[PDB]
Design an enzyme around this catalytic site. Structure first.
Site, PDB file in Angstrom:
ATOM      1  N   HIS A 130       2.318   8.896  -0.277  1.00 25.67           N
ATOM      2  CA  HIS A 130       0.982   8.720  -0.804  1.00 25.67           C
ATOM      3  C   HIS A 130       1.018   9.454  -2.135  1.00 25.67           C
ATOM      4  O   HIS A 130       1.578  10.545  -2.203  1.00 25.67           O
ATOM      5  CB  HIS A 130      -0.079   9.270   0.166  1.00 25.67           C
ATOM      6  CG  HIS A 130      -0.129   8.593   1.511  1.00 25.67           C
ATOM      7  ND1 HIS A 130      -0.909   7.478   1.723  1.00 25.67           N
ATOM      8  CD2 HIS A 130       0.468   8.850   2.699  1.00 25.67           C
ATOM      9  CE1 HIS A 130      -0.751   7.065   2.980  1.00 25.67           C
ATOM     10  NE2 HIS A 130       0.069   7.888   3.593  1.00 25.67           N
ATOM     11  N   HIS A 166       0.801  -1.223   0.000  1.00 17.68           N
ATOM     12  CA  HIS A 166       0.000   0.000   0.000  1.00 17.68           C
ATOM     13  C   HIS A 166       0.838   1.278   0.000  1.00 17.68           C
ATOM     14  O   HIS A 166       0.288   2.350  -0.215  1.00 17.68           O
ATOM     15  CB  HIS A 166      -1.129   0.001   1.038  1.00 17.68           C
ATOM     16  CG  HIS A 166      -0.786  -0.559   2.365  1.00 17.68           C
ATOM     17  ND1 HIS A 166      -1.412  -1.672   2.889  1.00 17.68           N
ATOM     18  CD2 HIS A 166       0.051  -0.124   3.296  1.00 17.68           C
ATOM     19  CE1 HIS A 166      -0.924  -1.917   4.099  1.00 17.68           C
ATOM     20  NE2 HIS A 166      -0.034  -0.980   4.374  1.00 17.68           N
ATOM     21  N   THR A 188      -4.445   6.787   8.730  1.00 15.16           N
ATOM     22  CA  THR A 188      -5.289   6.765   7.535  1.00 15.16           C
ATOM     23  C   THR A 188      -5.376   5.366   6.939  1.00 15.16           C
ATOM     24  O   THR A 188      -5.960   5.220   5.861  1.00 15.16           O
ATOM     25  CB  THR A 188      -4.811   7.752   6.464  1.00 15.16           C
ATOM     26  OG1 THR A 188      -3.528   7.374   5.942  1.00 15.16           O
ATOM     27  CG2 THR A 188      -4.779   9.146   7.048  1.00 15.16           C
ATOM     28  N   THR A 189      -4.762   4.391   7.622  1.00 18.34           N
ATOM     29  CA  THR A 189      -4.809   2.986   7.262  1.00 18.34           C
ATOM     30  C   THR A 189      -5.307   2.239   8.494  1.00 18.34           C
ATOM     31  O   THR A 189      -5.162   2.748   9.607  1.00 18.34           O
ATOM     32  CB  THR A 189      -3.399   2.549   6.833  1.00 18.34           C
ATOM     33  OG1 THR A 189      -3.358   1.199   6.405  1.00 18.34           O
ATOM     34  CG2 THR A 189      -2.392   2.568   7.959  1.00 18.34           C
ATOM     35  N   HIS A 222       6.784   7.127   4.778  1.00 20.10           N
ATOM     36  CA  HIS A 222       6.125   6.504   3.641  1.00 20.10           C
ATOM     37  C   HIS A 222       5.493   7.633   2.830  1.00 20.10           C
ATOM     38  O   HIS A 222       5.542   8.801   3.238  1.00 20.10           O
ATOM     39  CB  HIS A 222       5.129   5.433   4.103  1.00 20.10           C
ATOM     40  CG  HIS A 222       3.990   6.005   4.883  1.00 20.10           C
ATOM     41  ND1 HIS A 222       4.052   6.097   6.259  1.00 20.10           N
ATOM     42  CD2 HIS A 222       2.831   6.573   4.525  1.00 20.10           C
ATOM     43  CE1 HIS A 222       2.939   6.683   6.694  1.00 20.10           C
ATOM     44  NE2 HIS A 222       2.205   7.029   5.667  1.00 20.10           N
TER      45      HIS A 222
HETATM   46  C1  LIG Z   1       0.112  -0.247   5.614  1.00 19.53           C
HETATM   47  C2  LIG Z   1       1.452   0.049   6.286  1.00 19.53           C
HETATM   48  S1  LIG Z   1       2.129   1.516   5.791  1.00 19.53           S
HETATM   49  O1  LIG Z   1       2.050   1.641   4.366  1.00 19.53           O
HETATM   50  O2  LIG Z   1       3.582   1.675   5.946  1.00 19.53           O
HETATM   51  C3  LIG Z   1       1.403   2.819   6.467  1.00 19.53           C
HETATM   52  C4  LIG Z   1       0.390   3.606   5.702  1.00 19.53           C
HETATM   53  F1  LIG Z   1      -0.025   3.206   4.479  1.00 19.53           F
HETATM   54  C5  LIG Z   1      -0.230   4.826   6.247  1.00 19.53           C
HETATM   55  F2  LIG Z   1      -1.136   5.451   5.490  1.00 19.53           F
HETATM   56  C6  LIG Z   1       0.100   5.348   7.601  1.00 19.53           C
HETATM   57  S2  LIG Z   1      -0.474   6.743   8.156  1.00 19.53           S
HETATM   58  N1  LIG Z   1      -0.887   7.652   6.831  1.00 19.53           N
HETATM   59  O3  LIG Z   1       0.620   7.447   8.702  1.00 19.53           O
HETATM   60  O4  LIG Z   1      -1.586   6.647   9.061  1.00 19.53           O
HETATM   61  C7  LIG Z   1       1.108   4.597   8.360  1.00 19.53           C
HETATM   62  F3  LIG Z   1       1.476   4.997   9.596  1.00 19.53           F
HETATM   63  C8  LIG Z   1       1.779   3.391   7.795  1.00 19.53           C
HETATM   64  N2  LIG Z   1       2.572   2.904   8.765  1.00 19.53           N
HETATM   65  C9  LIG Z   1       2.838   1.561   9.196  1.00 19.53           C
HETATM   66  C10 LIG Z   1       3.948   1.578  10.265  1.00 19.53           C
HETATM   67  C11 LIG Z   1       3.996   2.872  11.090  1.00 19.53           C
HETATM   68  C12 LIG Z   1       4.729   2.749  12.417  1.00 19.53           C
HETATM   69  C13 LIG Z   1       3.865   2.844  13.667  1.00 19.53           C
HETATM   70  C14 LIG Z   1       2.347   2.972  13.546  1.00 19.53           C
HETATM   71  C15 LIG Z   1       1.767   1.607  13.855  1.00 19.53           C
HETATM   72  C16 LIG Z   1       0.365   1.535  13.354  1.00 19.53           C
HETATM   73  C17 LIG Z   1       0.037   0.171  12.782  1.00 19.53           C
HETATM   74  C18 LIG Z   1      -0.126   0.251  11.266  1.00 19.53           C
HETATM   75  C19 LIG Z   1       1.216   0.068  10.578  1.00 19.53           C
HETATM   76  C20 LIG Z   1       1.440   1.275   9.725  1.00 19.53           C
HETATM   77 ZN    ZN Z   2       0.506   8.009   5.547  1.00 15.76          ZN
END
Ligand code: A1IDV
Ligand code: ZN
Ligand code: A1IDV
Ligand code: ZN
EC number: 4.2.1.1
Lengths: 240, 240
Positions: free
Chosen positions: B77, B49, B181-182, B75
């Site tokens: 978008h 994603h 957002t995920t 990451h």
């Molecule tokens: C789907 C994993 S990811 O690609 O790396 C991901 C993501 F799409 C995303 F939209 C967000 S967001 N926009 O910042 O809400 C993420 F944070 C993202 N992060 C993975 C690891 C982040 C580290 C700690 C947060 C743990 C939350 C669990 C979800 C894992 C997300």
């Molecule tokens: Zn993000």
């Protein structure tokens, strides 16, 4: 000594409104469930450093949308005959007394998980000053202090409108980030200090300052911590 | 299906600067230790994603006095062939892309304790737009995407100045509290969105949007969530 009592961001502080930052994101405080039935009764305790009232479940406070808290207890700070005892000061003025209502973020099940965590705990603070009339909400507590004169004593009191111990104006307040003012002095506490004050009678203020005994065989009086430096923190205000 | 994704205080949101609340208490962001040496190398991965760069210990960040964070990951978008894919919008405008640097509060030892707790996680967000020059900082990441086109694949990349990926003026941002957002869409995330943008060449933006493959045999594109309602939340701004 607990080391957080030596942190850089401690409470209380001297509020200098001219240096406060107007922040229109600070909306009116909202309270729910504060108007208690008379039963079950609440426990009022002389704990040796203050008089505390333990609050039941269901008292909800919000600092804004999505910023929700549950009230745990309230206690008071005060001085002595002809001596103010508020914790916070305004432009170096100390007020006769101060009420604190301590809340726990709804994200945390227990106080120990919230301590030192940002926004984990939130305290509502109002100054108490002399007015002409007997404050009937305060009277329900003050009339029972004689029962709990001894350090470590407690008594049961009927529930009451806890919001009536606070000012009616919930729109106008200072807010900053600080600490517990008692060990362990954990940081991350959001302090809200109301602009409007609450009025007690001279007799009431004298009952509060003159009735309770503390550690040793000393009167429980002047139970306020010294003003702490802001150390670069900016107090916000909900009004310009 | 993660019911948290139907919570009241989700991200992203539409930013309307005229409705933002200016608070002079929001000071310039502090980002220390972001200038990484070439070694050790960092894991860059296509997780299906987004493209993610795991960050080492030592990247310290503060949103204010005693509100400190450590960077975990970044990451991006992005959209598609001549379609924007930023997550935040500004007055309805969607930018070509957006970078997110996710951080953990130093008050929490683990991410899993921070999830759902106010301020536990904090994200720095910047819009990426088209400009004439090729962006050196982004080239280090983009030039390496072809090696990880396949869902699940990864590669090591040299350390770089992560802060070079972020806009010029750390004085100037919006801030609000929202969600991931995920899934799991956890609330209590502090979003900071830089006011100014960062520029990449059309080629770079095409390289970003066109090189990676997602689930099945579909392209990894338009990896952004629809904007969510504020529901009474006020976005703050650090400038008048
Ligand atoms: C789907 C994993 S990811 O690609 O790396 C991901 C993501 F799409 C995303 F939209 C967000 S967001 N926009 O910042 O809400 C993420 F944070 C993202 N992060 C993975 C690891 C982040 C580290 C700690 C947060 C743990 C939350 C669990 C979800 C894992 C997300
Ligand atoms: Zn993000
Ligand atoms: C010493 C106990 S106290 O009277 O109730 C007390 C106090 F003096 C005080 F000054 C504060 S303050 N001004 O608001 O920082 C209190 F918060 C307070 N009581 C709290 C207890 C101390 C923190 C340990 C947590 C365990 C008990 C749960 C109730 C929290 C209220
Ligand atoms: Zn107190």
């Amino acid at each position: 000594v607990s080391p957080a009592c030596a942190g850089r961001f401690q409470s209380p502080v001297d509020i200098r409104p001219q240096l406060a930052a107007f922040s229109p994101a600070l909306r009116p405080l909202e309270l729910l469930g504060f108007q208690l039935p008379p039963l079950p009764e609440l426990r009022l305790r002389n704990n040796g450093h203050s008089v505390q009232l333990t609050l039941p479940p269901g008292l909800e406070m919000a600092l804004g949308p999505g910023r929700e808290y549950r009230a745990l207890q309230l206690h008071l700070h005060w001085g002595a005959a002809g001596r103010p005892g508020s914790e916070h000061t305004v432009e170096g003025h100390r007020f006769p007394a101060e009420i604190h209502v301590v809340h726990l973020s709804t994200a945390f099940a227990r106080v120990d998980e919230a301590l030192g965590r940002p926004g984990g705990l939130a305290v509502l603070a109002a100054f108490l000053e002399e007015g002409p009339e007997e404050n009937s909400a305060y009277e329900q507590l003050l009339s029972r202090l004689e029962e709990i004169a001894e350090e470590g004593s407690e008594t049961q009191v009927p529930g009451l409108d806890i919001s009536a111990l606070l000012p009616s104006d919930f729109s106008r307040y200072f807010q900053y980030e600080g600490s517990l003012t008692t060990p362990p002095c954990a940081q991350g506490v959001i302090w809200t200090v109301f602009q409007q004050t609450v009025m007690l009678s001279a007799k009431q203020l004298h009952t509060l300052s003159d009735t309770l005994w503390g550690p040793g065989d000393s009167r429980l009086q002047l139970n306020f911590r010294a003003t702490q430096p802001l150390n670069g923190r900016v107090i916000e205000a909900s009004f310009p």
